[PDB]
Structure 1
Amino acid sequence: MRHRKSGRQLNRNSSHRQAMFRNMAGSLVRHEIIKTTLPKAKELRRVVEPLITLAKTDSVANRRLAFARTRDNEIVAKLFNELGPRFASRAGGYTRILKCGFRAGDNAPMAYIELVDRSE
């Protein structure tokens, strides 16, 4: 009954959870701005920030391991080149969450999530 346990269920099984985490993380790293629910972004952090930390070091093995996630060559290409130097001098906290109210369709807690600076 959840004693020192982590990992939300999101009303999905492991395969769907992993797939939609992967799609969400790819969309975020592509766009640098995503609006979604609070738990979804909170669980996104634990996938994207380690991905950024892995991308901080550029190597063929590191690039292959990164490609094992997000299943996208363009996503990895954007990594190790753009977000690497930007977050090279940053130790964690690459993403931040800004609440923006609730949806009008299902009344779900909405929040924007973005990077630190976004170069904008």
Structure 2
Amino acid sequence: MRHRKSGRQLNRNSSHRQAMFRNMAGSLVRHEIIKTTLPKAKELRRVVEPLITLAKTDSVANRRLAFARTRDNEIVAKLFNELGPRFASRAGGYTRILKCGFRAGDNAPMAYIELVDRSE
């Protein structure tokens, strides 16, 4: 009856769910805007924001904890150097959701999930 529980199952086991959250968070860090379904973006708000929260302070061990997630060197290289000193003033809530119609393949609620960016 899931009283006071959080965490969307998304019709997948925890291995595939964690792996696709890893890959989708890496894609959102790399491309700065992606287009997916709505609850995946809702749960990716609980994934990307702790990554940026860990990326607030640059050190030796924080790079290893940010490499323990996203399993990639280019993603942690874009972290702590580009996103770090640019999201320094804002405290939390670095993402943004945009509902964009429905997909023509299966009628699913679509959403552009992005960061507060692209003023380059």
The alignment's TM-score, normalised by the length of structure 1, stands at 0.98
**1:112 to partner: Cα distance:** 0.3
| Cα distance per residue 1:37-80 (max 9 Å; x no partner) | 11000100100011001001001100000000000011101100
What is the aligned-residue RMSD (CA, Å)? 0.7
Q: Distance in 1 between matches of 2:67 and 2:118?
A: 23
**Residue 117 of structure 1: how far off its partner (Å):** 2.2
Deviation of 1:107 after TM superposition, in Å, equals 0.3
Measure the CA separation in 2 of the matches of 1:72 and 1:96.
24
Runs of 4+ in 1 over 2 A off after TM superposition: 117-120
SS of the counterpart of 1:112? strand
> Does structure 1 retain, via aligned residues, the 8 Å contact 2:29–2:75?
yes
1:6-63 Cα shifts (integer Å, max 9, x gaps):
0000000000000000000000000001000110001001000110010010011000
State how far apart, in whole Å, the 2-side matches of 1:12 and 1:118 are.
33
Asked if 1:43 is matched to 2:43, the reply is yes
Q: How does 1:44-59 map to 2 (within 5 A)?
A: 44-59=44-59
Unpaired segments ≥5 residues, structure 2: none
CA contact (8 A) 2:32 2:117 kept: no
How far the C-alpha of 1:119 sits from its partner, in A, is: 3.0
